[PDB]
Tab-separated table of N, CA, C and O in Angstrom:
chain	number	residue	atom	x	y	z
A	535	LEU	N	91.687	109.646	76.584
A	535	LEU	CA	91.715	108.586	75.579
A	535	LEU	C	90.682	107.502	75.880
A	535	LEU	O	90.163	106.854	74.972
A	536	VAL	N	90.393	107.309	77.162
A	536	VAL	CA	89.467	106.275	77.606
A	536	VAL	C	88.014	106.740	77.512
A	536	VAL	O	87.141	105.979	77.089
A	537	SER	N	87.757	107.991	77.886
A	537	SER	CA	86.407	108.544	77.785
A	537	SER	C	85.958	108.684	76.329
A	537	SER	O	84.917	108.155	75.937
A	538	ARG	N	86.751	109.394	75.533
A	538	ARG	CA	86.428	109.612	74.128
A	538	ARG	C	87.491	109.007	73.219
A	538	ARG	O	87.318	108.947	72.003
B	777	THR	N	123.891	115.321	102.623
B	777	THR	CA	123.049	114.293	102.006
B	777	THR	C	123.143	114.367	100.483
B	777	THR	O	122.131	114.496	99.793
B	778	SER	N	124.374	114.281	99.981
B	778	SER	CA	124.710	114.605	98.594
B	778	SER	C	123.812	113.962	97.537
B	778	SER	O	123.575	114.551	96.483
B	779	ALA	N	123.320	112.759	97.813
B	779	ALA	CA	122.487	112.041	96.852
B	779	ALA	C	121.160	112.758	96.595
B	779	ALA	O	120.492	113.206	97.528
B	780	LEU	N	120.809	112.896	95.317
B	780	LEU	CA	119.518	113.454	94.921
B	780	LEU	C	118.464	112.373	94.665
B	780	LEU	O	117.278	112.675	94.521
B	781	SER	N	118.914	111.117	94.619
B	781	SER	CA	118.062	109.949	94.367
B	781	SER	C	117.143	110.114	93.152
B	781	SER	O	115.920	110.109	93.289
B	782	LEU	N	117.737	110.287	91.973
B	782	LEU	CA	116.961	110.520	90.754
B	782	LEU	C	116.720	109.312	89.828
B	782	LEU	O	115.849	109.359	88.959
B	783	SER	N	117.470	108.234	90.021
B	783	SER	CA	117.381	107.072	89.133
B	783	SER	C	116.220	106.150	89.499
B	783	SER	O	115.486	105.642	88.639
B	784	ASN	N	116.063	105.956	90.801
B	784	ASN	CA	115.050	105.074	91.352
B	784	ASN	C	113.647	105.494	90.950
B	784	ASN	O	112.810	104.670	90.537
B	785	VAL	N	113.400	106.793	91.062
B	785	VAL	CA	112.103	107.332	90.715
B	785	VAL	C	111.921	107.212	89.203
B	785	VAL	O	110.801	107.119	88.722
B	786	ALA	N	113.017	107.186	88.450
B	786	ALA	CA	112.903	106.944	87.016
B	786	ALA	C	112.451	105.499	86.804
B	786	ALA	O	111.742	105.187	85.840
B	787	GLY	N	112.848	104.623	87.725
B	787	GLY	CA	112.400	103.240	87.690
B	787	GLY	C	110.899	103.132	87.909
B	787	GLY	O	110.172	102.468	87.142
B	788	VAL	N	110.413	103.806	88.951
B	788	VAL	CA	108.973	103.794	89.205
B	788	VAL	C	108.241	104.535	88.080
B	788	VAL	O	107.036	104.360	87.884
B	789	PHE	N	108.973	105.361	87.339
B	789	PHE	CA	108.408	106.005	86.165
B	789	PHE	C	108.222	104.938	85.094
B	789	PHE	O	107.233	104.954	84.357
B	790	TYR	N	109.170	104.003	85.017
B	790	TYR	CA	109.062	102.936	84.029
B	790	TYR	C	107.863	102.046	84.351
B	790	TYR	O	107.125	101.623	83.445
B	791	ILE	N	107.619	101.807	85.640
B	791	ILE	CA	106.486	100.943	85.982
B	791	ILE	C	105.173	101.721	85.817
B	791	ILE	O	104.122	101.133	85.540
B	792	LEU	N	105.239	103.045	85.956
B	792	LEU	CA	104.060	103.879	85.732
B	792	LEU	C	103.656	103.846	84.269
B	792	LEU	O	102.477	103.691	83.941
B	793	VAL	N	104.645	103.977	83.390
B	793	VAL	CA	104.386	103.940	81.958
B	793	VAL	C	103.876	102.557	81.566
B	793	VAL	O	102.997	102.431	80.704
B	794	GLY	N	104.397	101.522	82.223
B	794	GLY	CA	103.870	100.183	82.019
B	794	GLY	C	102.397	100.082	82.393
B	794	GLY	O	101.583	99.499	81.659
B	795	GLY	N	102.047	100.678	83.531
B	795	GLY	CA	100.664	100.714	83.970
B	795	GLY	C	99.770	101.487	83.020
B	795	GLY	O	98.585	101.174	82.872
B	796	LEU	N	100.340	102.487	82.355
B	796	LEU	CA	99.596	103.248	81.359
B	796	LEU	C	99.366	102.405	80.113
B	796	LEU	O	98.312	102.493	79.476
B	797	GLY	N	100.352	101.583	79.770
B	797	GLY	CA	100.205	100.669	78.654
B	797	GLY	C	99.103	99.655	78.903
B	797	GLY	O	98.271	99.401	78.027
B	798	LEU	N	99.080	99.088	80.108
B	798	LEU	CA	98.010	98.159	80.479
B	798	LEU	C	96.652	98.867	80.493
B	798	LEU	O	95.622	98.289	80.116
B	799	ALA	N	96.663	100.126	80.922
B	799	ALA	CA	95.452	100.935	80.952
B	799	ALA	C	94.883	101.119	79.554
B	799	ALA	O	93.672	101.018	79.346
B	800	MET	N	95.763	101.383	78.593
B	800	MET	CA	95.349	101.510	77.202
B	800	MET	C	94.867	100.159	76.673
B	800	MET	O	93.945	100.094	75.852
B	801	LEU	N	95.490	99.086	77.157
B	801	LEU	CA	95.109	97.732	76.762
B	801	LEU	C	93.664	97.453	77.164
B	801	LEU	O	92.918	96.814	76.422
B	802	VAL	N	93.273	97.928	78.343
B	802	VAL	CA	91.895	97.755	78.798
B	802	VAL	C	90.974	98.730	78.051
B	802	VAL	O	89.816	98.417	77.745
B	803	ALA	N	91.515	99.903	77.733
B	803	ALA	CA	90.772	100.935	77.015
B	803	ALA	C	90.339	100.459	75.628
B	803	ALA	O	89.258	100.812	75.147
B	804	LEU	N	91.178	99.644	74.997
B	804	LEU	CA	90.870	99.132	73.665
B	804	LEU	C	89.677	98.181	73.702
B	804	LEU	O	88.761	98.298	72.885
B	805	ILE	N	89.674	97.252	74.654
B	805	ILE	CA	88.589	96.281	74.748
B	805	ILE	C	87.329	96.966	75.269
B	805	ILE	O	86.216	96.465	75.080
B	806	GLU	N	87.509	98.108	75.929
B	806	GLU	CA	86.376	98.873	76.444
B	806	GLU	C	85.708	99.713	75.348
B	806	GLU	O	84.495	99.932	75.381
B	807	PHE	N	86.497	100.179	74.381
B	807	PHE	CA	85.964	100.967	73.270
B	807	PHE	C	85.557	100.098	72.081
B	807	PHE	O	84.843	100.549	71.181
B	808	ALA	N	86.022	98.851	72.083
B	808	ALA	CA	85.693	97.910	71.021
B	808	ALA	C	84.267	97.419	71.208
B	808	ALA	O	83.441	97.470	70.291
B	809	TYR	N	83.982	96.986	72.431
B	809	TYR	CA	82.681	96.441	72.791
B	809	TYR	C	81.864	97.469	73.558
B	809	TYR	O	80.845	97.949	73.069
């Protein structure tokens, strides 16, 4: 969720 | 040692989920800007  | 000690770790599970909420909170300001 944080990366993409 | 009859006790399985299952409630306490559910407590640290609650603080883990809290930490995930804060993590998402930082994730929002990180994806916004």
